Amino acid sequence: SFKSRALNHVKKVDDVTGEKVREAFEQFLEDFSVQSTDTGEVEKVYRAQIEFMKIYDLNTIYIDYQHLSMRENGALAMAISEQYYRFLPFLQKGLRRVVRKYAPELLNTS
């Protein structure tokens, strides 16, 4: 046997602000609801954009900052404005879970 030590990830600290940002953003991404110049049935533009990505096998999502600004008193928008570099991985985590739910075809280059 070789002299060695077990180094363990489960004793990590988690960023509670980042996780809560991910929760808020994930919910916003899947269920932000609006429509205009049409029926009142809401389009859910970012879920529909995920479908467009799934059709044209894209790998980016365009987000209007003002839609975040109106969401949840704009607290999420302020957080992402002030400390974007901290929260971008958490936003990717949330986006990945939403894509799993509504377009799991896209989790690979496919």
Binding site: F2, A6, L7, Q27, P104
Partner: protein, 665 residues
């Protein structure tokens, strides 16, 4: 030599071509002699990797993707054959390859453990071999929403149909094998980065602990995926009706599955106790408090501005520091002159079980989605409402026997299983009057207390700290339940005589040793101690006789060392520590034992602006404690200038002056 390895890998690759493949006429199609090929691969596992203790086939099979690209297609399409036919009813043959595929899945998903007894090849191959099991877990959960899980329950239903009388030993084995499949699929978890320590560390440590292979993310492995795929394949329904049908050959794996669900999830996460965005705003305000605190610990001008403070001490000598804010605040200057030291005292170090609440970081939550939270909580609710008392009676009626051969893993998983659901039903009942404490009544039947006591006593005597810690946790929830049923009302009186003498002594001696062990060990010791004290007070053989066994300096060292983590502890835990101090110091009046400088420093560090939340209830308790503590210390020093030096040291165990130090006449 590695020539044998390339020969092996070549054989496994050819076998991978023999299993089957897609047909363009797309559908998966089995190969010719497919049953013989599957049997030969099972043979390879036994013939080489088990009998020679290697895991080389277990590696090669992952290299040639047999599980993901043959066996799951076979099982899913066979499930589709049977499920489509079931609405309409050579299956008698294809059933055999489906069974053998499930056998191979149980083999390839078998929980790997490395010990001193594991071979050199095994401990070498362990780290990378774990990664392929994680790929297997991802693929098993994701593929067609995990329809292979429905294939597995169909293979189980095809013996549950024939009676309790009818099922042969082979049928019993097949059902147990399906439970092992579910257990394994839950149980796979990322491996630990096992560094070699022959050669010293460089000027930078390990770059990252992440062990996941590049096609896996931790969200693929998270409980959300397990709960989602299990709900969408009605695995929860299968397990619930299976435990409803318990009227015992399979009881150990079923227990083990419930352990593997519960082992790392906190009960209060399943209860609430714009809302997510509102709470995000609350979080942002909480860290903004830290911003307005660190700002005062920050220079108002650039770092090179560099005005020099000199601290003249009370004596005719001078120190120097560059802190621009420290010029107007000697508090900052003193603690900076302390932090400036290059010296640190050197500090000391310190497997066949998985990670759990036994060893996680104390705040490590699982982030359920709301639907997965609902599905999981309703499943375990229905389990409590149906399966708890019978399953616990079944396994404890076993485990009273064969305690000598109860392997350590089996012990810890059993104790944790008991504790988790007892705690859960207490919480659900404290929330809902509709939920009944007696729905976990099997916990209180004296056979159970006897067994858990035996496990704790034996593990302590054997110095098995792992099972000791788990039995301590189980005792905490048992006493929690006992106090509740004391209020709900005979068994309380019975156990309140059975935990006399040797059990008092043992429970008193856990927090004497606990200061040497991990934070969770100490936390469980403190939790047990608070539970014990409130139980004994609810009873109140003599109260002073028991509590004197706790009020001694090794216990206080455990309490202080636990409280050193106050920034990372939860507010309720600080409340529990300070309630213990409240009893010991204010009520029991052994106040001399807490006049020691470790506590003095710790009190200042948490009462400092860099410490507790200004509006915290625990901050209120620390402030309330500290005013009285300072008053009593002031009194004792006014009555004893010797205690200015005694504050620095352990109090004197030479009783002839020790009594005078303790009370001062």
């Amino acid at each position: 030599a590695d020539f044998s390895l390339t020969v092996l890998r070549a054989r496994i690759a050819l076998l991978a071509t023999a299993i089957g493949g897609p047909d363009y006429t797309p559908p998966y199609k089995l190969g010719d002699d497919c049953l013989a090929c599957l049997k030969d691969l099972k043979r390879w596992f036994k013939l080489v990797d088990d009998q020679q203790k290697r895991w080389d086939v277990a590696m090669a099979v992952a290299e040639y993707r047999i599980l993901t690209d043959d066996l799951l297609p076979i099982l899913i399409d066979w499930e589709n054959k049977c499920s489509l036919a079931a609405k309409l009813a050579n299956k008698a043959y294809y059933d055999k390859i489906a069974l053998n595929c499930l056998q191979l899945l149980v083999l390839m998903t078998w929980p790997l453990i490395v010990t001193e007894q594991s071979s050199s090849n095994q401990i070498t191959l362990y780290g990378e071999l774990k990664k392929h099991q994680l790929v297997y877990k991802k693929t098993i959960l994701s593929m067609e929403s995990g329809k292979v899980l429905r294939a597995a329950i169909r293979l189980a239903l095809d013996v549950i149909k024939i009676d309790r009388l009818s099922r042969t030993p082979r049928d019993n084995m097949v059902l147990k094998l399906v439970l092992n499949f579910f257990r394994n699929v839950i149980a796979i978890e990322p491996g630990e980065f096992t560094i070699n320590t022959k050669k010293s560390m460089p000027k930078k440590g390990i770059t990252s602990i992440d062990t996941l292979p590049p096609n896996v993310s931790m969200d693929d492995i998270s409980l959300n995926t397990v709960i989602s795929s299990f709900h969408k394949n009605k695995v929860f329904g299968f397990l619930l009706t299976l435990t409803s049908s318990l009227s015992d050959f399979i009881n150990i794996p079923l227990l083990e599955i419930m352990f593997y669900f519960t082992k790392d999830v906190n009960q209060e996460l399943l209860f609430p106790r714009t809302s997510a965005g509102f709470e995000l705003s609350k979080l942002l305000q909480k860290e903004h408090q830290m911003r307005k605190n660190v700002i005062k610990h920050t220079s108002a001008r650039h770092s090179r501005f560099g005005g020099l403070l000199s601290i003249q001490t009370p004596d005719k000598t001078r120190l120097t520091v560059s802190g621009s804010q420290a010029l107007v605040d000697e508090k900052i200057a003193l603690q900076k002159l302390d932090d400036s030291k290059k010296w640190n005292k050197r500090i000391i170090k310190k497997e066949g079980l998985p990670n759990s609440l036994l060893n996680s970081q104390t705040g490590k939550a699982i982030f359920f989605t709301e639907s997965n939270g609902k599905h999981f909580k309703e499943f375990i609710n229905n389990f409590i409402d149906s399966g708890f008392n019978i399953l616990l009676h079944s396994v404890t009626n076993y485990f009273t026997t064969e305690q000598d051969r109860m392997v350590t893993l089996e012990q810890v998983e059993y104790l944790l299983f008991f504790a988790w659901f007892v705690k859960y039903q207490l919480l659900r009942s404290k929330i809902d009057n509709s939920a009944d404490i007696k729905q976990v009544s099997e916990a209180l039947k004296e056979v159970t207390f006897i067994l858990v006591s035996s496990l704790l006593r034996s593990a302590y005597d054997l110095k098995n700290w792992t099972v000791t810690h788990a039995g301590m946790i189980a005792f905490n929830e048992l006493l929690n339940l006992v106090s509740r049923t004391k209020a709900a009302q005979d068994i309380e009186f019975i156990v309140s005589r059975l935990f006399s003498d040797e059990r008092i002594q043992l429970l008193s001696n856990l927090p004497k040793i606990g200061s040497k062990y991990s934070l969770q060990f100490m936390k469980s010791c403190i939790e047990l101690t608070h539970s014990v004290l409130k139980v004994l007070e609810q009873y109140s053989v003599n109260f002073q006789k028991v509590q004197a066994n706790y009020m001694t300096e090794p216990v206080i060292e455990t309490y202080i060392n636990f409280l050193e983590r106050f920034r990372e502890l939860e507010d309720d835990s600080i409340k529990k520590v300070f309630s213990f101090f409240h009893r010991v110091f204010v009520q029991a009046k052994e106040q001399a034992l807490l006049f020691r400088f470790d506590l003095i420093i710790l009190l200042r560090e948490m009462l400092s602006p860099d410490g507790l939340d200004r509006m915290s209830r625990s901050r209120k308790y620390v402030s309330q404690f500290s005013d009285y503590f300072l008053a009593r210390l002031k009194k004792r020093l006014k009555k004893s200038p010797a205690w200015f030096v005694g504050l620095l040291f352990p109090p004197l165990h030479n009783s002839e002056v020790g009594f005078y130090q303790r009370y001062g006449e």
